[PDB]
Curated annotation (Swiss-Prot), chain A:
There is a cross-link at residue 222 (Glycyl lysine isopeptide (Lys-Gly) (interchain with G-Cter in ubiquitin)). It comes from Saccharomyces cerevisiae (strain ATCC 204508 / S288c). GO terms for biological process: proteasomal ubiquitin-independent protein catabolic process; proteasome-mediated ubiquitin-dependent protein catabolic process. It is found in: Cytoplasm; Nucleus. Signal peptide: none annotated. Gene3D superfamilies: Glutamine Phosphoribosylpyrophosphate, subunit 1, domain 1. This is Proteasome subunit alpha type-1. Keywords: Acetylation, Cytoplasm, Isopeptide bond, Nucleus, Phosphoprotein, Proteasome, Ubl conjugation. GO terms for cellular component: mitochondrion; nucleus; proteasome complex; proteasome core complex, alpha-subunit complex.
From Swiss-Prot, chain B:
SMART domains: Proteasome_A_N (SM00948). It is found in: Cytoplasm; Nucleus. The lineage of its organism: Eukaryota, Fungi, Dikarya, Ascomycota, Saccharomycotina. Present with 17100 molecules/cell in log phase SD medium. The proteasome degrades poly-ubiquitinated proteins in the cytoplasm and in the nucleus. It is essential for the regulated turnover of proteins and for the removal of misfolded proteins. The proteasome is a multicatalytic proteinase complex that is characterized by its ability to cleave peptides with Arg, Phe, Tyr, Leu, and Glu adjacent to the leaving group at neutral or slightly basic pH. It has an ATP-dependent proteolytic activity. This is Proteasome subunit alpha type-3. It comes from Saccharomyces cerevisiae (strain ATCC 204508 / S288c) (Baker's yeast).
From Swiss-Prot, chain C:
Transmembrane segments: none annotated. The lineage of its organism: Eukaryota, Fungi, Dikarya, Ascomycota, Saccharomycotina. GO terms for cellular component: nucleus; proteasome complex; proteasome core complex, alpha-subunit complex; proteasome storage granule. PANTHER family: PROTEASOME SUBUNIT ALPHA/BETA. It comes from Saccharomyces cerevisiae (strain ATCC 204508 / S288c) (Baker's yeast). Present with 7060 molecules/cell in log phase SD medium. This is Proteasome subunit alpha type-2. The proteasome degrades poly-ubiquitinated proteins in the cytoplasm and in the nucleus. It is essential for the regulated turnover of proteins and for the removal of misfolded proteins. The proteasome is a multicatalytic proteinase complex that is characterized by its ability to cleave peptides with Arg, Phe, Tyr, Leu, and Glu adjacent to the leaving group at neutral or slightly basic pH. It has an ATP-dependent proteolytic activity. It comes from the Eukaryota. It is found in: Cytoplasm; Nucleus. Keywords: Cytoplasm, Isopeptide bond, Nucleus, Proteasome, Ubl conjugation. Belongs to the peptidase T1A family. There is a cross-link at residue 108 (Glycyl lysine isopeptide (Lys-Gly) (interchain with G-Cter in ubiquitin)). InterPro entries: Ntn_hydrolases_N, Proteasome_alpha, Proteasome_alpha-type, Proteasome_asu_N, Proteasome_sua/b. The gene is PRE8.
From Swiss-Prot, chain H:
GO terms for biological process: proteasomal ubiquitin-independent protein catabolic process; proteasome-mediated ubiquitin-dependent protein catabolic process. One of its GO terms (cellular component) is proteasome complex. This is Proteasome subunit beta type-1. It comes from Saccharomyces cerevisiae (strain ATCC 204508 / S288c). The 26S proteasome consists of a 20S proteasome core and two 19S regulatory subunits. The 20S proteasome core is composed of 28 subunits that are arranged in four stacked rings, resulting in a barrel-shaped structure. The two end rings are each formed by seven alpha subunits, and the two central rings are each formed by seven beta subunits. The catalytic chamber with the active sites is on the inside of the barrel. The active site is at residue 1. It is an enzyme of class 3 (hydrolase).
């Protein structure tokens, strides 16, 4: 059964190597969540540092692709960094050729088309990663676009990725049924981060210290990650309500 | 490495046959029957469309009979997509020859080159051969009216009347039985249709399931690709419907 | 290093079957239903928008794609394979036609170029076939309105009306009963929505259905005035509202 | 390489080509044959840059001889002239162009007609009753325009050629050491032994 | 078993079998000894014949005036690697007017052998080399293995029954290391070392091959009647 | 050593009422020397007429090229190319050789088989399109033709009148150019008939 | 199955068995460690003395990249040399364009992307080495460890090879007992001790110790080998601790 | 073209004229010769407009890609990238560049890449006429750790003199001030600077 | 050739003359120098006519493919960056001198491009042999905060200065108006001030005037 070793069709019309690449996604046992505010897009990811010898500042699955685009990865760090370096290269080249900052959704489509090639060409293996791209686009506003090893991509009101993805998804689904809108009706990004963290706690049923979380925030004309002290200030606000 | 997944499409069997050529010919044997009949004053090409659907657009359809230049046509049996690659190559080779010598390409030269391309795929490159058999109907000022066939092996031969695709055994016996050398085009038209009518796997032969063409002659050669209504008429006139 | 796979991954089996093409068609069968109907004064192409998640924004994923101002495409099968085929189709409409003849290719010739790309994935080294069937609807001055199906093999056939994917067998039977040569465009849209309701199980509205037409020229969509010969694109994607209006009188 | 003349009469083509090869201040040879048989009924005369002339002529000869073997058929003069023109037309936009001018004289066995083709180094092809290359046309064309008749016999054509060669020997400053004359007709190619 | 088809495949225990099989070619090869003092470095090689009518396969190759090696295993591979060393020695002389350090020679052979163990289609080298030289830091002996592992040693041996000679040099270490400014005595120690790897056959005039390099001694190979002194 | 004026010759095209006319001289020379009085510079691919002036080897080469390309067009499109489309093809093909151009002045003439609209167009050697209602001129006597055309031409001429106008435009232009003349051909092109007339002119 | 026969093939688990097999080769290798300190990094390695015939101090395993980066590895020694050679090309091309010597995080990703590339194709074999490397840049001291998969992180202390579990345990104690930080000269002595303690898992053959260091204060931000009196002082300290 | 870059207490200022000439015709009299290659790394371009615009755009790309991977680049790093492009393609390029940048560590820095393709680090630099750099240019006039107001006046005066004697220079005086505070754009109209 | 671009309140306007010249000879008395790159991005060309048309269509083609790929209306900065990088690569051997103007989601833009690949920004620009005549009118009458009607008047006046005073320019004035939130309006032959006066005499020939050697029916059919 060499139809399970390379990206060719099985008799039932499946690509097993693509399906197994999806299973590699959850190898890190990390859950990510992305939501949109009025003016911002917030992405939160669990931060697990099991080894005591590790330098925790270097353990990250959130990447600053460009000045406006942020990318969180669910999957092994080698494939994550492979995708990150390529996305950084693609965003820079776009700006040089076309004279404007590469949009979140166009970078997503580009990285998805690269992923698609790995599912059709045999010599290249798929990357075992799901890429969640966030920005505040100058045309579309707050944007979430997610890529997977099948070369599939789509836009999201909000999204979740990881082992306990379904639990976070239904939690957010239920909120948007109630609120009757496509975003978190909140002025400041600080309170959109507080919402993201609150709903992850409710979905996973676990509490978080300042070192258990990793936060990325997209505003107009910059994407930035929060320090441990920025998160800690945010966790205090939640607790005092 | 990649050696593991190589089918080795260009190797001999212990019996000294080319596996992929033999299996390509098996493929072609399931294709709709194509008959060429060469008369003293023209050539007939008749081909059976593969199990037609009622909602198929019959009038603006080309499956079996293709024009190579003003003096040469081919009937196809096998993968249509493979045939079209080869047909465009042949159309270009014909215009290259006309550009070079200011003379319409002699039929055999075009046939030999197209056959030599097929041969190449069986001896080198490690690709699957073209799953196509052609009947070439053409005229030149040297040999006059000529019928050839080529198959995936790249072998070509000349014929007075020939069939390719499904039920060639049965079709060749019927042609061998009723064919004679002093035959007219109108007689050859009747033979071609009668032969398809008896060899067909369909309940009854109808205009909508047929493609038809004649290369006839006050000193010029005319190619007539028959319209649906013109097939309907010739099918009533010969008394098959 | 380097692509060592310079040999065909699609080969003839002893039975004469091309396994990878057969298996690609199996993937298309599992695919969501899409259909095309040709009227006298236009063509309609339609498909269900199977939403992966309700959090997903189904507007962003476009299953019906403009190839040229007068040519549109829908698919059944693997969405990513379709997306890269649309990109290659748009580019080849320019590189191998528009940049030579200064006009957009006729439906049959663009279909021919798409078919060629899909045939190459069937024979070239180190690649699998495309796991999609395309329905391409188009208009051109000398051929008028036309509808073509393109298969993983690279084979294409012109249709009066057809369907591909999940419920194509049942959908094709339904179209055979309803289709005549005197259909106006509005009649073909009506039939398309009736046909597609059979194959859709869940919600059936303008947000779960994607539908485009090749019809009259749209001066309003051209984006400039002053050139009388330039009258605008014949391809128009129907809005969520325009679909819901035709579902009331159903 | 200077003088190449051609006359197409009723039933044959006559090619006259100067015998002199000059390098610097000395005449190296006075018996040079500036012609190659392309096929049994097709002859090509050539003049131009040293080396290029023979190299081009022999290259064309080999390609026509190859076609004859492959198809067991003699390519028509029109077909040979079209092939030769295309090779020269390729040459002109090459890195180093062939500076060769040719006359192709052939008998078409299908039409039963003699044919003369004049092709210059640019690939400028023209079908003519009579033709020349370089300065040769300047002293003979006025003479040909006058006496040439299309129903002329081979003997009439040879006499008209003598008149042209005599005018060249009188008014031309260089000594071309006379001409070799070859006739192309239905029976093939033969050389006039004495001129 | 399933993991020895090529050099691009690790075994479940993390072994490269094609490299281990290449290493096996060296064990089948005829014994060659290397040893050095502070002043001189010596190669001793037992040359192998096809039969009594044949010549004896040359084991020692000169690379420069100050460097050369002995081979055990595939002789053609030794020719490829020795030719590569000659070019690197030569590049160093022409570009930098600098004799190539024996250590750098080792590093270059290691890196060349490594590339042939990581790429599909290629195969590992099937030869082991003992490189001796005298450079700016004195006498040197290297052991090359086609795994890419190069090792600097006072003495060693490679080939069939090499363990005998290697055990002797391990015992003698303190004696032969101090043979300074005395070529003949250092060769004698090398010839007595290789003698510990002999079975049935003894050292003859056209059988023994010796090479030496040192302070005021260019890399010179002794064969035939020239090695009669040391029998 | 100016490739456009070695061989010499002229083409002119004109529009009339439901008709177009294209005409050329028959001279091919090698500078001062007249070589051929039968070198036609007007070719047709179906119902689309192309005149080409300039370097004769490129005139022959471009004819052979556009025959090739229009033959393949017809096989694939299953219909004869139209003047408007052919114009773009000539433009594309010339600009492809931008930095090694064909030394030619091509002129397109024909009637659109669908709309019945008379069409003419001219190009420079790198394929810049000159689309014109009235007339197009090309060759070594282009200045002379511009003068003749700009004074003689009036719109909506009938085929029989247009013939006289374009004939007189060409003849009188060719007689004031050393490298043009030696005979002339005029094509009168109606929707579904085409007449070709050889003019009698001075042979110097 | 057969998912472990070809590199770059995902198992139904979503694992690359060929990379996991490369780790076995690393686990089979000698012990190597890295210790991050106040203003720099320390590297140490276990060199097994197979024979008396090995020349002491003249089989150096620790490699320098540029002038400021130290590299040590466990597993297939040639694979480590191949990786360092590439590192030197990357560090050279960075300095050529951007002038500044390559920052350690920048350099880490250059090795990372290269090693990861050798897990994308079946035409290549994964690297059979774990590489402990680091040095001093404009942002201070950095220590990294890189694995056959292409995975790397920043470390306070790093260990790999046959005695990794022993070394890791002894590294974890240093992190706990020195939260305010360890000095460069201290880290050299601790590095020696940890190699001697880690040698208990490889005690058939006796061994030779090898230490290098980059320190802003002690080496002026450059990579130097610990030799002579400072090396013998560290050996004596380690000898005293085992007894 | 008259351009200069001066380092002062709080950072560096970039000044230039606004005149672009084709022969004696002023193609653009309101030219912006102050070009951003990073937030706080700007350059003044002299030589071929096409060549300097092409180079500036490539350097902008390289510093964007540098920032993505390695964070904010030093002025030295920007100077290096400029020099690399200018030095390697010296045979087909006519470009003289002055690089001015602000770091929080290094403060204000000025680098010149002249027509040679060499790199020089200076406290200040002036280029007058055809990319002609002046070594001295009133050495006693420039002091280290000048105030912003002193430095603006020093550049305004220097560029005033150049415009007066040179027809290549003219129009308005544009300045960009690079400090910890941020980026300030200054424009001085002819009626201000001509009466100096 | 005279081409101008003028920025106004809510957009940009470009204008050009309609004369095409081979040296001193007028080849086309009414050619169009206003080229569409995109529906709302228009280009005016000067220099080698084949090069301006060729470069405008190539970038126009690549812009359409980029617009489709990104699902976004094309930006003028994209047309600018793609034109200049193409022109620069050929070191001026493509003699295209362009005024690029248009509206996009970002707003209204006006740029000039030089054959060597240098670009400039302006509120008013002119290019071609009539640029100095045109620029004299722009430097005389241009002000900040022009209306649409003021900008068309200024643009066409600038082209007229070229038509009358420059021998390279003549015939008619073409204008294209790109306003924000509106379809761009192409005003072909906006002004026709150079109408040819009635001729003194009809040069229509009596039929049979021309001598004819041979007639023959040409076969255009199959
Ligand atoms: Cl892409
Ligand atoms: Mg694959
Ligand atoms: Mg004349």
């Amino acid at each position: 059964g060499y139809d399970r070793h390379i990206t060719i069709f099985s008799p039932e019309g499946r690509l097993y190597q693509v399906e197994y690449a999806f299973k590699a996604t959850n190898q890190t046992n990390i859950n990510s969540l992305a939501v949109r505010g009025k003016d911002c897009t917030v992405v939160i990811s669990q931060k697990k540092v099991p080894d005591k010898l590790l330098d925790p500042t270097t353990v990250s699955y959130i990447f600053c692709i460009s000045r406006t685009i942020g990318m969180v990865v669910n999957g092994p760090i080698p494939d994550a960094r492979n995708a990150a370096l390529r996305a950084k290269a693609e965003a820079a080249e776009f700006r040089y050729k076309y004279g404007y900052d590469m949009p979140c959704d166009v970078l997503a489509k580009r990285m998805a088309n690269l992923s698609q090639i790995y599912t059709q060409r045999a010599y290249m293996r798929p990357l075992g990663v799901i890429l969640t791209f966030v920005s505040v686009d100058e045309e579309l506003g707050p944007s979430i676009y997610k890529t997977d090893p099948a070369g599939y991509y789509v836009g999201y009101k909000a999204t979740a990725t990881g082992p306990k993805q379904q639990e976070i998804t239904t939690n957010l689904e239920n909120h948007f049924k109630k609120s009757k809108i496509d975003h978190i009706n909140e002025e400041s990004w600080e309170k959109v981060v507080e919402f993201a963290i609150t709903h992850m706690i409710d979905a996973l049923g676990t509490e978080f210290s300042k070192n258990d979380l990793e936060v990325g925030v997209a505003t107009k004309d910059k994407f930035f990650t929060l320090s441990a002290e920025n998160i800690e200030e945010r966790l205090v606000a939640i607790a005092e309500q | 490495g990649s050696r593991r997944y190589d089918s080795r499409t260009t190797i001999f069997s212990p019996e000294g046959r080319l596996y992929q050529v033999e299996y390509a010919l098996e493929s072609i044997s399931h294709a709709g029957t194509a008959i060429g009949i060469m008369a003293s004053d023209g050539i007939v090409l008749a081909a059976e469309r593969k199990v037609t659907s009622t909602l198929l657009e019959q009038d603006t359809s080309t499956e079996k009979l293709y024009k190579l230049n003003d003096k040469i046509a081919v009937a196809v049996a096998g993968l249509t997509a493979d045939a079209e690659i080869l047909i465009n190559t042949a159309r270009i080779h014909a215009q290259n020859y006309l550009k070079t010598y200011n003379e319409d390409i002699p039929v055999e030269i075009l046939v030999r080159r197209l056959s030599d391309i097929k041969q190449g795929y069986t001896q080198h490159g490690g690709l699957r051969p073209f799953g196509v058999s052609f009947i070439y109907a053409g005229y030149d000022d040297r040999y006059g009216y000529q019928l050839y066939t080529s198959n995936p092996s790249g072998n070509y031969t000349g014929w007075k009347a020939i069939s390719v695709g499904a039920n060639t055994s049965a079709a060749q016996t019927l042609l061998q039985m009723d064919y004679k050398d002093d035959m007219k085009v109108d007689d050859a038209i009747e033979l071609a249709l009668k032969t398809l009518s008896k060899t067909t796997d369909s309940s009854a032969l109808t205009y909508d399931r047929l493609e038809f063409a004649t290369i006839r002659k006050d000193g010029e050669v005319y190619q007539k690709i028959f319209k649906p209504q013109e097939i309907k008429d010739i099918l009533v006139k010969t008394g098959i419907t | 290093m380097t692509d060592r796979y310079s040999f065909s991954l699609t080969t003839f089996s002893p039975s004469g079957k091309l396994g990878q093409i057969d298996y690609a068609l199996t993937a298309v069968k599992q695919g969501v239903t899409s259909l095309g109907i040709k009227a006298t004064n236009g063509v309609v192409i339609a498909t269900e928008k199977k939403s992966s998640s309700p959090l997903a924004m189904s507007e962003t994923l476009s299953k019906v794609s403009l190839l040229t101002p007068d040519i549109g495409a829908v698919y059944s099968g693997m969405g990513p394979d379709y997306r890269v085929l649309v990109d290659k189709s748009r580019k080849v409409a320019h590189t191998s036609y528009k940049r030579i003849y200064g006009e957009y290719p006729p439906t049959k010739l663009l279909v021919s170029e798409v078919a060629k790309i899909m045939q190459e994935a069937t024979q070239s080294g180190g690649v699998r076939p495309f796991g999609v069937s395309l329905l391409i609807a188009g208009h051109d001055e000398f051929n008028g309105f036309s509808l073509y199906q393109v298969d993983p093999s690279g084979s294409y056939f012109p249709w009066k009306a057809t369907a591909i994917g999940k419920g194509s067998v049942a959908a094709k039977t339904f179209l055979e009963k309803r289709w005549n040569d005197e259909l106006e465009l509005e009649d073909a849209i009506h039939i398309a929505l009736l046909t597609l309701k059979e194959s859709v199980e869940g919600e059936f509205n303008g947000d779960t259905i994607e539908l485009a037409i090749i019809g009259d020229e749209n001066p309003d969509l051209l984006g400039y005035t002053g050139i009388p010969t330039d009258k605008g694109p014949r391809f128009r994607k129907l809005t969520s509202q325009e679909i819901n209006d035709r579902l009331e009188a159903l | 390489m200077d003088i190449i003349l051609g006359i197409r009469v009723q039933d044959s083509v006559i090619l006259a080509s100067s015998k002199a090869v000059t390098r610097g201040i000395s005449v190296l040879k006075d018996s040079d044959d500036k012609t190659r048989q392309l096929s049994p009924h097709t002859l090509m005369s050539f003049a131009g840059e040293a080396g290029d002339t023979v190299q081009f002529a022999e290259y064309i000869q080999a390609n026509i001889q190859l076609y004859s073997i492959r198809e067991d058929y003699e390519l028509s003069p029109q077909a040979v002239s079209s092939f030769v023109r295309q090779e020269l037309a390729k040459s002109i936009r090459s890195r180093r162009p062939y500076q060769v001018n040719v006359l192709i004289g052939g008998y078409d066995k299908k039409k039963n007609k003699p044919e003369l083709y004049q092709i210059d180094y640019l690939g400028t092809k023209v079908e003519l009753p009579y033709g020349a290359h370089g300065y040769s046309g300047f002293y003979t064309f006025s003479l040909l325009d006058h006496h040439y008749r299309p129903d002329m016999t081979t003997e009439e054509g040879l006499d008209l050629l003598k008149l042209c060669v005599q005018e060249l020997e009188k008014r031309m400053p260089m000594d071309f050491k006379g001409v070799i004359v070859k006739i192309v007709d239905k029976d093939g190619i033969r050389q006039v032994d004495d001129f | 078993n399933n993991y020895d088809g090529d050099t691009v495949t690790f075994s479940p225990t993390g072994r490269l079998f094609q490299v281990e099989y290449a290493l096996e070619a060296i064990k089948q090869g005829s014994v060659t000894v290397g040893l050095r003092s502070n002043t001189h470095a010596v190669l001793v090689a037992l040359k192998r014949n096809a039969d009594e009518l044949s010549s004896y396969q040359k084991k020692i190759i000169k690379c420069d005036e100050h460097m050369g090696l002995s081979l055990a295993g595939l002789a053609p591979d030794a020719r490829v690697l020795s030719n590569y060393l000659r070019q690197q020695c030569n590049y160093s002389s022409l570009v930098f007017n600098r004799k190539l350090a024996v250590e750098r020679a080792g590093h270059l052979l290691c890196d060349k052998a490594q590339k042939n163990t990581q790429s599909y289609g290629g195969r590992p080298y099937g030869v082991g080399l003992l490189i001796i030289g005298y450079d700016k830091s004195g006498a040197h002996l290297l052991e090359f293995q086609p795994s890419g592992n190069v090792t600097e040693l006072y003495g060693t041996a490679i080939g069939a029954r090499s363990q005998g000679a290697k055990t002797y040099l391990e015992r003698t270490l303190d004696t032969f290391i101090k043979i300074d400014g005395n070529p003949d005595e250092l060769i004698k120690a090398g010839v007595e070392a290789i003698s510990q790897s002999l079975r049935d056959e003894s050292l003859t005039v056209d059988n023994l091959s010796i090479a030496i390099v040192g302070k005021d001694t260019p890399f010179t190979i002794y064969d035939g009647e020239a090695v009669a002194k040391y029998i | 050593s100016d490739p456009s004026s070695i061989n010499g010759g002229i083409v002119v095209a004109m529009t009339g009422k439901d008709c177009v006319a294209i005409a050329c001289d028959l001279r091919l020379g090698s500078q001062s020397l007249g070589v051929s009085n039968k070198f036609e510079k007007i070719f047709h691919y179906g119902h689309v007429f192309l005149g080409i002036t300039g370097l004769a080897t490129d005139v022959t080469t471009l004819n052979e090229m556009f025959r090739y390309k229009t033959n393949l067009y017809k096989l694939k499109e299953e219909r004869a190319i139209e003047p408007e489309t052919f114009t773009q093809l000539v433009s594309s093909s010339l600009y492809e050789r931008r930095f090694g151009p064909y030394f030619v002045g091509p002129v397109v003439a024909g009637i659109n088989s669908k709309s019945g609209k008379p069409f003419i167009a001219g190009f420079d050697l790198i394929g810049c399109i000159d689309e014109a209602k009235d007339f197009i001129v090309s060759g070594t006597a282009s200045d002379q033709l511009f003068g003749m055309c700009e004074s003689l031409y009036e719109p909506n001429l009938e085929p029989e009148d247009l013939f006289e106008t374009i004939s007189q435009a060409l003849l009188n232009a060719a007689d004031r150019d050393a490298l043009s003349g030696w005979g002339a051909v005029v094509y009168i092109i109606k929707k579904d008939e085409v007449v070709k007339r050889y003019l009698k002119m001075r042979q110097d | 199955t057969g998912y472990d026969l070809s590199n770059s093939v995902f198992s139904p688990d979503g694992r690359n068995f060929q990379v996991e097999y490369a780790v076995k080769a690393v686990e089979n290798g000698t012990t190597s460690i890295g210790i991050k300190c106040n203003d720099g990094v320390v590297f140490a390695v276990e060199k097994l003395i197979t024979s008396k015939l090995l020349v002491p101090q003249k089989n150096v395993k620790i490699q320098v990249v540029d002038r400021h980066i130290g590299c040590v590895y466990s597993g297939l020694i040639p694979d480590g040399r191949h990786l360092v050679n590439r590192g030197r090309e990357e560090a050279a091309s960075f300095k050529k364009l951007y002038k500044t010597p390559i920052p350690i995080p920048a350099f880490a990703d250059r090795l990372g992307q290269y090693v990861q590339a050798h897990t994308l194709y079946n035409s290549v074999r994964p690297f059979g080495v774990s590489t402990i490397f680091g040095g001093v840049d404009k942002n201070g001291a950095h220590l990294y460890m890189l694995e056959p998969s292409g995975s790397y992180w920043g470390y306070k202390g790093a260990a790999t090879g046959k005695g990794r579990q022993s070394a890791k345990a002894e590294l974890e104690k240093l992190v706990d007992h020195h939260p305010e930080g360890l000095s460069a000269r201290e880290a050299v002595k601790q590095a020696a001790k940890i190699i001697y303690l880690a040698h208990e898992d490889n005690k058939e053959k006796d061994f030779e110790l090898e230490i290098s260091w980059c320190s802003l204060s002690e080496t002026n931000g450059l990579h130097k080998f610990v030799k002579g009196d400072l090396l013998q002082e560290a050996i004596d300290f380690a000898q005293k601790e085992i007894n | 073209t008259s351009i200069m870059a001066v380092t002062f207490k709080d950072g560096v200022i970039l000044g230039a004229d606004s005149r672009t000439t084709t022969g004696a015709y002023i193609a653009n009299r309101v030219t912006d010769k102050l070009t951003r290659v990073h937030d706080k790394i700007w350059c003044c371009r002299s030589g071929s407009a096409a060549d300097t615009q092409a180079i500036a755009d490539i350097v902008q790309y390289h510093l964007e890609l540098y920032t993505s991977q390695y964070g904010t680049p030093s002025t030295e790093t920007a100077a290096s990238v400029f020099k690399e492009l200018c030095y390697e393609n010296k045979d087909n390029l006519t470009a003289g560049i002055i690089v001015a940048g602000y770091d929080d560590k290094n403060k204000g820095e000025v680098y010149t890449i002249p027509l040679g393709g060499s790199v020089h680090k200076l406290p200040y630099a002036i280029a007058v006429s055809g990319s002609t750099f002046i070594y001295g240019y009133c050495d006693k006039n420039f002091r280290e750790n000048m105030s912003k107001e002193e430095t603006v006046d020093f550049i305004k005066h220097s560029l005033s003199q150049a415009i007066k004697w040179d027809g290549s220079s003219g129009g308005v005086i544009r300045m960009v001030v690079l400090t910890a505070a941020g980026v300030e754009r200054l424009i001085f109209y002819p009626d201000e600077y001509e009466q100096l | 050739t005279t081409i101008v671009g003028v920025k106004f309140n809510n957009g940009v306007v470009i204008a050009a003359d309609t004369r095409s010249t081979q040296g001193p000879i007028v080849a086309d008395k009414n050619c169009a120098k206003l080229h569409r790159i995109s529906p709302k991005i228009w280009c005016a060309g000067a220099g080698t006519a084949a090069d301006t048309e060729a470069v405008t269509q190539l970038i126009g083609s690549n812009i359409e493919l980029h617009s489709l790929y990104t699902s976004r209306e094309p930006r003028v900065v994209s047309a600018l960056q793609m034109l200049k990088q193409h022109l620069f690569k050929y070191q001026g051997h493509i003699g295209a001198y362009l005024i690029v103007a248009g509206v996009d989601p970002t707003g209204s833009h006006l740029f000039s491009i030089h054959a060597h690949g240098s670009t400039d920004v302006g509120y008013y620009l002119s290019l071609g042999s009539g640029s100095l005549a045109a620029m004299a009118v722009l430097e005389s009458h241009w002000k900040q905060d022009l209306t649409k009607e003021e900008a068309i008047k200024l643009a066409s006046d600038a082209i007229q200065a070229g038509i009358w005073n420059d021998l390279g320019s003549g015939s008619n004035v073409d204008v294209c108006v790109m306003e924000i939130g509106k379809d761009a309006e192409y005003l072909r032959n906006y002004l026709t001030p150079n109408v040819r006066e009635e001729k003194q005499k009809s040069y229509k020939f009596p039929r049979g005037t021309t001598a004819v050697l041979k007639e023959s029916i040409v076969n255009i059919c199959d």
